[PDB]
Design a protein around this nucleic acid. Sequence first.
DNA 1: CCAGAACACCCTGTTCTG
DNA 2: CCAGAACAGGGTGTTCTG
Lengths: 81, 74
Amino acid sequence: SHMCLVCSDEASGCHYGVLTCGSCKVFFKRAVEGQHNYLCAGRNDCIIDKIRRKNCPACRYRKCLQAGMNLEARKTKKKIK
Amino acid sequence: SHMCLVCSDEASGCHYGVLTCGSCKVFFKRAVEGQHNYLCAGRNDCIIDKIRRKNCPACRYRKCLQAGMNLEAR
DNA sequence: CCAGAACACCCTGTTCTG
DNA sequence: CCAGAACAGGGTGTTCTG
Ligand SMILES: [Zn+2]
Ligand SMILES: [Zn+2]
Ligand SMILES: [Zn+2]
Ligand SMILES: [Zn+2]
């Protein structure tokens, strides 16, 4: 019953190594598999929350990285301990 | 040959009273009618240019109004 | 030439499947 | 539980129509 660490929406589980909602889970996967040459229109600190997370993919992706999301998370936990 | 005064894309003609591109023309009309209440994720001063105009409809719509865009101007 | 409508795509987020 | 795929919708921008 926790909150997505990236956007504070209703979290759905531990995804790519972090507590997140589903939207952030698929957003991160899409961002890492393509290019993430996104551009912030503000000052690289946009507020990423449930209604505003769509505004700035640049800052959203940055928060994903900063919370520790990574593709090999599940496979890394499966080497422990 | 010219420049949209809202997003700086190549403008297409005078729309709603102002030199704008086509995307800004239709954005503005949708903003006034659909009257969604948009919310900035920054500080209400986002850069509105070709690639970023889509990031912040609140600020884009503000820049539209500030450039003089107006529905009943014809 | 411009307003408005239609179309066509992208991005997103929910649901399905392995 | 959680990854990845599929599917459904909203916003955006170009083209079409009045
Ligand atoms: Zn989230
Ligand atoms: Zn940002
Ligand atoms: Zn424009
Ligand atoms: Zn803004």
